[PDB]
Design a protein around this ligand. Sequence first.
Ligand SMILES: [K+]
Ligand SMILES: [Mg+2]
Ligand SMILES: [Mg+2]
Ligand SMILES: [Mg+2]
Ligand SMILES: [Mg+2]
Ligand SMILES: [Mg+2]
Lengths: 222, 222, 196, 196, 195, 195, 125, 212, 233, 204
Amino acid sequence: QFNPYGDNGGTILGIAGEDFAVLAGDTRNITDYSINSRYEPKVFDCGDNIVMSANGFAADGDALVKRFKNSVKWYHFDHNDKKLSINSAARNIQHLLYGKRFFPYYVHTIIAGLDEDGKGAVYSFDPVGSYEREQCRAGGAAASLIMPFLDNQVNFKNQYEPGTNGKVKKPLKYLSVEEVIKLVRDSFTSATERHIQVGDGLEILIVTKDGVRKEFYELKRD
Amino acid sequence: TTIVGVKFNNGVVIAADTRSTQGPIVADKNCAKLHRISPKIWCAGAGTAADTEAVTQLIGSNIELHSLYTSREPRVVSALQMLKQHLFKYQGHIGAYLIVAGVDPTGSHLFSIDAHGSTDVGYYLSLGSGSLAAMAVLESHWKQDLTKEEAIKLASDAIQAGIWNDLGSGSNVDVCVMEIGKDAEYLRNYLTPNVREEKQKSYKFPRGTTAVLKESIVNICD
Amino acid sequence: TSIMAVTFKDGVILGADSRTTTGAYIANRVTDKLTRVHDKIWCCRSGSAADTQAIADIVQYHLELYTSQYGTPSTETAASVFKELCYENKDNLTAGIIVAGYDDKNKGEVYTIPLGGSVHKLPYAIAGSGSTFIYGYCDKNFRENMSKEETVDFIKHSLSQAIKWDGSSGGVIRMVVLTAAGVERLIFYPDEYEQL
Amino acid sequence: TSIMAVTFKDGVILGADSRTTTGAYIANRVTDKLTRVHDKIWCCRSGSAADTQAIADIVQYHLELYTSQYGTPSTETAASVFKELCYENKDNLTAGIIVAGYDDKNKGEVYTIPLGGSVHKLPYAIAGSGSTFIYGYCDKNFRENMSKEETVDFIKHSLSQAIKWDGSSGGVIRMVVLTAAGVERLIFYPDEYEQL
Amino acid sequence: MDIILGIRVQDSVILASSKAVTRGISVLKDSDDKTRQLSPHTLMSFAGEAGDTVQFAEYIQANIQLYSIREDYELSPQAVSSFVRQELAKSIRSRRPYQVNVLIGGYDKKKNKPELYQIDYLGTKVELPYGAHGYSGFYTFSLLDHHYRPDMTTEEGLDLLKLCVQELEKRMPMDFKGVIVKIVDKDGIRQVDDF
Amino acid sequence: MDIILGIRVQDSVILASSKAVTRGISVLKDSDDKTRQLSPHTLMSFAGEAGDTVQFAEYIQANIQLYSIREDYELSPQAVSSFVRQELAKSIRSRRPYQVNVLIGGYDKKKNKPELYQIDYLGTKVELPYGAHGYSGFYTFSLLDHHYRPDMTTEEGLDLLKLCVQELEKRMPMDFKGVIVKIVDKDGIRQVDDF
Amino acid sequence: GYDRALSIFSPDGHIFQVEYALEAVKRGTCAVGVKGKNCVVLGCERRSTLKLQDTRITPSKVSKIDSHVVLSFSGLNADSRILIEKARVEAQSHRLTLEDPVTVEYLTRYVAGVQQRYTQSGGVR
Amino acid sequence: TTTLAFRFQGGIIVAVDSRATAGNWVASQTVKKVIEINPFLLGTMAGGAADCQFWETWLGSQCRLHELREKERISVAAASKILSNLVYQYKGAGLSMGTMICGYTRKEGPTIYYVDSDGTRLKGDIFCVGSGQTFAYGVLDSNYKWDLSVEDALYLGKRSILAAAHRDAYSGGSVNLYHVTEDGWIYHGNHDVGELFWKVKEEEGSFNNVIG
Amino acid sequence: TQQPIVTGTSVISMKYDNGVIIAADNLGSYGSLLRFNGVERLIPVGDNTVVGISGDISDMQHIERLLKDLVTENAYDNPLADAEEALEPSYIFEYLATVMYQRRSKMNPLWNAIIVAGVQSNGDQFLRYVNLLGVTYSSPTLATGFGAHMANPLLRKVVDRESDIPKTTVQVAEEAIVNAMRVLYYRDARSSRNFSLAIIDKNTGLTFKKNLQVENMKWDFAKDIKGYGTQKI
Amino acid sequence: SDPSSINGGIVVAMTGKDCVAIACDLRLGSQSLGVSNKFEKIFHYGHVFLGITGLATDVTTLNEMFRYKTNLYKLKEERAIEPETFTQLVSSSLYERRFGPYFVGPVVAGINSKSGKPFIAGFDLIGCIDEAKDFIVSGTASDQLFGMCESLYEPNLEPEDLFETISQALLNAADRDALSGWGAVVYIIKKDEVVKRYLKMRQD
Ligand SMILES: [K+]
Ligand SMILES: [Mg+2]
Ligand SMILES: [Mg+2]
Ligand SMILES: [Mg+2]
Ligand SMILES: [Mg+2]
Ligand SMILES: [Mg+2]
């Protein structure tokens, strides 16, 4: 019997700072035990300072990104070139996903950008459109490896102030873009070591009020 | 697993990668897939990890007793016969896919064994999930009348093909050279082309970060 | 596999391709499917590689122990031992074996043993997946009391066609000649047999 | 079924056995599997009797309506109509059809259409369950630009062997000759072809 | 859902229906009224698939109320029961059938007679002196076969009904949290509050 | 079978076990004692597959009684619980495993302490202040998490137990016909008759 | 389907078909509504050129839409039945979804909406 | 999930956890399972996250359209029935929802409706919904009286979620409290179980099963 | 829902400094039966694109007709049909990719794996893959079926990343492709000896080579291999 | 009904400078229902520590079995078993049940008393040995533990620092797993002193 779904592997990661947000993802694309491409990007600039990735089944991932990009285009046409805010983009994507509730897009979607107060924003979606704004989210094959590390290092979970008898928590604070990229790179190299579907390369898209910048780093190719 | 075996002028060489997986997770980054059956008979193993270890140890044990009984150095065909009959008896349920090689009074030998009990003879062989990547290299570069150094190069190149192109294989290349008239030389981590890069950050915690409820001394003495 | 054995004036010749598969992958392109159970009693193997090897090994053991006690076994006897194993373990075996040997009294003889474990003595026998494509050709071309050169050409042309159509067959054409003169091994490479 | 069509110097000849089955029962031993879709465009039918008849009927209708408007259709055109039906209804059809016709410009032509609905133009084509047994024979014996008598003998000998080995084939060997001279029907009975 | 009973006596029809609504390992409610008034002298109790029951009951209720307004007239219990049966008989060959079993208790004012109809989800209608749906019948039918008389009073019918509930509370595996009892007679429909 | 509870307080272990035995749509019995005395200061309650339960309980009882006679000595609750666990741990890889879950309440006379052990059919043993098997735990554990204190008296334990039974009688789908309550302390095993 | 736009604007900005429908109302028997402090009374004229009538069965001029709302009319009698039927169906549909009977304003708004739809739909008067 | 809502002398209490799961994977610890439909209406979410989230925000749009058309806030009964009738149309398609529509209106007073994806709709005083509903019931039922003070009722709702968060593996994160009065709903904070458990254990003296 | 009947095996390809090379054998398999030997599985579109197709052949012939029609439709009312508004490889791919994904979304796929190789108008090499699932990806080397397992490793030794492309000549690239085709003939049970090869160069244009054969094979060592373990004769 | 994830739990081990650490959670549940918050998964036989995750009945059985075997070993050998030797015993014992295995994920940790070398090892359910320089993970949050360890770990940590690293590895991994947590225990092991610490963690 024909199976319309497939698994293209890879993993993605979104972190939000005070005045910026990053959306990272490895560039490896796979089926079963073969590598299809060592460089096939899956993090995209969708306009209006919104970056997006839909990781899992690449055909669905591409289709969704394609449709959202097109949604941004028509939002301009219909509402006098108004900028699509990240919260509005999130709600729109929910409807794109839930529209196929009974034949889902097999993807874990993350978008990143800035909210209307200029602060960093990351939204994450399940395959059928359930969404939530967070400081932090990993998605895809190695999400289970990376996410707990993010809880510890971004949100300072389980970390208490030394000598306070485990009574005073380590206080929450925004991270600099330099600190965030360090965590992203360490997250992906760690994931590369222990997950076979993660490697080859790492592409990070950084979003500030000035626009969308890119950074690329080699990952292990085994 | 990727594993290979290559015959040359005055003996035989085998090689293997060092990745061990549990689904998509790398359980062991540097496991030993080259097994000693007797001093000059070695076995490369793919398949179920515990099976290749256990069946190689059992036959190795019985080969040692046989060698002592007969006052003779063990032959590769004896290990071949004992392994295949054991595996056939278990109708494939013992998932061991082996490349058996070595030197004995009869000469130098290279064989392969499938989990179900079939054996092959050849000048070059490859088994495991990366066997197609390896065999592609072997079919491209193998020739009659290889030297020792040529055969090592060909064998390790065939393993590398697996390391880079097969997600089931990774990390390092182990090699074992069995030459006639000489001691077998086991080359553990002959190549290490997958060294982890320096981490961006030290995650050493301030002492007292973890909240503690109780302390106590444990008694290990009598 | 494509395999066959053919009797002729001076004895019998066995023939086989050299391909072993797992699915569509060729696990071995230089396999030897012609296999000695006694000096001048050989067999062609088809079906499960593990099963046919395990069977041939047991038969070779049985005939070696036979020879120690009662001297050279007949080709019929060898076929009977194959049958006994194939028949009694039919539920757990996938083996299609052709048994061929040379006596001085009986000259060349061929026995084929299909899946069920039945025995069939024939002037010639074909078996394996590729045999289906040459039933027509072999029936039209086989003659009794052929010469050595004629029988070699018959097997060469036959297996060439079996190989051409069957994806599960290929590589080299191996042959083993069984006569009073002794045992001769022949090999024929693609470049020769493909353009026949 | 065993069916075939063969081009030659003066045109093309179609051939077929006459057996139809339900399981091992022969429902019809004198079936006519050679079928007219146009004056000098015929087809050989294999697979489901209902499917191939329904298809042939629709094609004959299409070509009759074609002829009314645009004159005599080419053999290629006829094959394209068969393909269109077989391809678009592949999920619901079990039909292996060989299309053969005679033009004066193009002379003899043969198109085979397997299960999937693909089209293949060939010098000659064989199909049906019994075809498997004569791939070897037909490949070794077919020559281009044969005479009428040679082509008849080629088809007769080929289908004789296909019938001999395939249980699903048998009865009489029907043949239809397509040349500039016209349309000739030939029949050959067991007593002749069995002892070839 | 689960337990619905009905008894027709001399001058009235009495319906008893369990109060429990259970989902999984939890009794979500213990005061559920598994009945709808279709007209002033016609009451329908129901049991079956979750959701289907109330949806079907209220759909019937709306239709009968629509009829009442259109004609300024109350349909007979027999007429209502036949309408209900046909709706279920249509339903059973639909893409998704209503899985609802009903009892219809009514007082025919033209005949001055109580009437009880038992209809299952297939659209199987029968008029009965006493009725039950589901596993309840396996206890109550034999009990009523013994103790029921056709000339009983409403009070005698209520005592007869108490005997059924007691038996069910003794031998039924599940806790159905008692019953709501309603009486249908010449004066309409009223609920017994202390049962 | 179905509901078995256990509470360990300051000076005693209290076991409560449902009285109902249901087969199909019939409650066959409402006074069933789902417990066996293994020794003078050790009591085992049980629940699970029909037949398996009593067969397993009595088999354990026989073995402990055999031990008692042989050594003229009472095994500790810990020792008995470990014996029982091993028997179940053997059982789970047998051709036909015992499908029985048990609670073992005992008073250790050498330690002068009450002890409660929860063991499932797989042979999964835990010592607990309060325990339950089956769906009962889904209500009682959270209830006891709130109201339980380690220094409670037997009377306080019984009131705490009444609170559990009341909750189960409110929210459980099935009628389990109340519970038999037994107390295990320094003076042995006794049954509370009015619960 | 019959598509003709029957209700259309004229040069002076009138929809004659709607205005001619008002003439039909003007021809109809008189109806009056008066509301007091605690009641509403609906009065209706019945023309007396019809003797030998059967008043038991003859359609009454005042119709109950629900148990708490009534509707009387003036104009074409056959037309009124269609409006009354739709109103009665909407009354029950409202009770079904909102679990509350219609307000008089809501019921009126529905009936008026139906009437309006028939002034800019093709193929209808 | 674990969610509850109950009625008492001083109105309605609504309490929920904040965990989302994909099998045994804890996907989130900060999910909003209460949706604020209007200043007098609340909706709780249990089951499929998308299903609940999508259709309850859709419900909010339908409630807004009602008050535009009718010039009056929608009744709790009518709001709940819009949702129940919607899911009933999808019955069999595989929607997974356990919801509670809570609110106050003049004609109804404080009202709670249970609505689930197989079309069940129930008015009631107390409901607990989700995988940890039984744990919440155990504490809530055994401490519930109608005459609870606003202060005591808020705590009991909070304590009942905590009970379930502790015992149910698929509940946890934090507690979100709400109080519904004649004047509308009032938010009573997000309470992380990380700190709330130990605070309750110490002050109340409960949770003696846990190593202190 | 389908099942493939007449099938074509590996399509292999790679980029080199000035263009792309693509190859595929001339076999139409019918299960294990090697049924048709004159099957061309490389289809040129214009003078700048070659589409290589594996999988179901009936679906391949349908795709041929679609591409043929696309050329016709593009020429309509288009004075620059053989110039600026000629069909680019990237247009041809996106069209096929759209079709493939739409067909999978209707649960009635075209049972194929497709590689579109060509050169864009600005001289850029184009090489991209698409299959029955609508999955698309690009890489310096691309291969389908067994080619993915056996050819890619060999071709990746020549061009392992982007920077290796300018360093690779057409002579070196073709040599690697031809070698890979030989290896597939050794090891793929549904391959043939005869194949076609196409080069699309930004300077010399489209070169289509038909009736190529695998040659310089190693079989001699087979004579030395006897038995399966212990046998000596 | 997947034996290895009915009860839940995790174990992790790490090496440091002249020391080893092994840690485990305390949860024992029955799928969603948390039953016990006192269920320790680490045991020791002499100076050799063994942690076991998976099906709890097999955890208890194997502990009892290895206590049995190491007690007889000591009586006959007249010395305590070493980690390398005990590792081999665990592997043999598990492979003995090749086609009817214990559903466990054991982890050996300890210091060889002769050489002084820190040693850790892991096993699958049928005994395959997984030796490591750095860390071994096991249990229902093994993915999480792999991610935590692979990023947090560095070589040659001092006992007091190693405690922080392994504790943070366990805690944050446990909080992303529904079936792990409910308390935690960490063993710090030096050549001739062992310290056992209970960690404060969230109880949901
Ligand atoms: K290994
Ligand atoms: Mg690799
Ligand atoms: Mg026949
Ligand atoms: Mg009935
Ligand atoms: Mg929890
Ligand atoms: Mg085991």
